[PDB]
Curated annotation (Swiss-Prot), chains A, B:
Outcome recorded upon mutating C61G: Loss of E3 ligase activity and affects the joining step of V(D)J recombination
Superkingdom: Eukaryota
Protein name: V(D)J recombination-activating protein 1
Shown residues in whole-protein numbering: 265 to 380 of 1040
Function of the protein: Catalytic component of the RAG complex, a multiprotein complex that mediates the DNA cleavage phase during V(D)J recombination. V(D)J recombination assembles a diverse repertoire of immunoglobulin and T-cell receptor genes in developing B and T-lymphocytes through rearrangement of different V (variable), in some cases D (diversity), and J (joining) gene segments. In the RAG complex, RAG1 mediates the DNA-binding to the conserved recombination signal sequences (RSS) and catalyzes the DNA cleavage activities by introducing a double-strand break between the RSS and the adjacent coding segment.
Binding site for Zn(2+) 4: C91, C96, H108, H112
Modification note: Autoubiquitinated in the presence of CDC34/UBCH3.
Free-text domain note: The RING-type zinc finger mediates the E3 ubiquitin-protein ligase activity. The NBD (nonamer binding) DNA-binding domain mediates the specific binding to the nonamer RSS motif by forming a tightly interwoven homodimer that binds and synapses 2 nonamer elements, with each NBD making contact with both DNA molecules. Each RSS is composed of well-conserved heptamer (consensus 5'-CACAGTG-3') and nonamer (consensus 5'-ACAAAAACC-3') sequences separated by a spacer of either 12 bp or 23 bp.
ZnF RAG1-type span: 87-116
The species this protein was found in: Mus musculus (Mouse)
Source species taxonomy: Eukaryota, Metazoa, Chordata, Craniata, Vertebrata
Entry binding sites for Zn(2+) 1: C2, H6, C29, H31
UniProt tissue specificity: Maturing lymphoid cells and central nervous system.
Subunit and partners: Homodimer. Component of the RAG complex composed of core components RAG1 and RAG2, and associated component HMGB1 or HMGB2. Interacts with DCAF1, leading to recruitment of the CUL4A-RBX1-DDB1-DCAF1/VPRBP complex to ubiquitinate proteins and limit error-prone repair during V(D)J recombination.
Family listed: Belongs to the RAG1 family.
Length: 116, 116
C-alpha cells in the first residue's frame, strides 16, 4: 500500500488537537498528506490517492460526495503548504532520536549512514 | 451572543482548506477560537463556550460526547497556539484595507483613529 511510501501521523513530534491532525491528513489513506491537492470542495488528498478513487470509484469527492474531476485538482494555498511542510516528525530509524521537518525528512532518511 | 466578542472565520485573509479552517474554529460557537482550551479528548472550544455547555448541558464533550469536566480543560500545545495566533485576518472596519495577525488584532482595532 501507500504505507510503504507515506508517513503515519503517529510520527508527529508534537501532540496536536485531533481536528488539526485531521486537517493535515489525506482523507482517503489517512497518512500525512504527500503531494496534497485540493478539490473544488476544499478537501485534501495525496495526488495519487484521489486520482485512483476518481477512476475506480467514480467522479465524486470521497469526503463529501460532490462531483469531482482530475481537472479540478489544484495545489493547496501557500500558507497551508507552509504549515504542513514544517511539521516536526520523529524519525523511526533504530536508535536515531532525531526530529526533522516534513520537507527535510527525505533528505534525513537518505543521509542516514548505512551498515556496510 | 459571543459574536459581539468573537471573530468570524470569513475574516480570514487566506482561503484555507475546509478541514484546516475547522481545526482553528470553536466546535460550539464556530468562531475563530478565542482563548482555546483542549478537552481530554483533544477537541477545541473557547474557554467560555465550553464551560457554559458543561454547566447547562452536562458533563460531556459537545464534539464526541465523552465525559468532560472543567478541571480537564488545558491549553493547546504551543505549536498549535503559534499557528492560530499567526492567522492573517482582514479588518472589516469601513475603508480600512488592512490585514493583521490574530495576536495583533485587538491592538489594531484599538489603535483605529476615531471620528471626534
Ligand atoms: Zn498513504
Ligand atoms: Zn493519501
Ligand atoms: Zn469534498
Ligand atoms: Zn533518523
Ligand atoms: Zn463565539
Ligand atoms: Zn466558542
Ligand atoms: Zn470530544
Ligand atoms: Zn482596520
Amino acid at each position: 500500500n501507500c504505507s510503504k511510501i507515506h508517513l503515519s501521523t503517529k510520527l508527529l513530534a508534537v501532540d496536536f488537537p485531533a481536528h488539526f491532525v485531521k486537517s493535515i491528513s489525506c482523507q482517503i489513506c489517512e497518512h500525512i498528506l504527500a503531494d496534497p491537492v485540493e478539490t473544488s470542495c476544499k478537501h485534501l488528498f495525496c495526488r495519487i490517492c484521489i486520482l485512483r478513487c476518481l477512476k475506480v470509484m467514480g467522479s465524486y469527492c470521497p469526503s463529501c460526495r460532490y462531483p469531482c474531476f482530475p481537472t479540478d485538482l489544484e495545489s493547496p494555498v501557500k500558507s497551508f503548504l507552509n504549515i504542513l511542510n514544517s511539521l516536526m516528525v520523529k524519525c523511526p530509524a533504530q536508535d536515531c532520536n532525531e526530529e526533522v521537518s516534513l520537507e527535510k525528512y527525505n533528505h534525513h532518511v537518505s543521509s542516514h549512514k548505512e551498515s556496510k
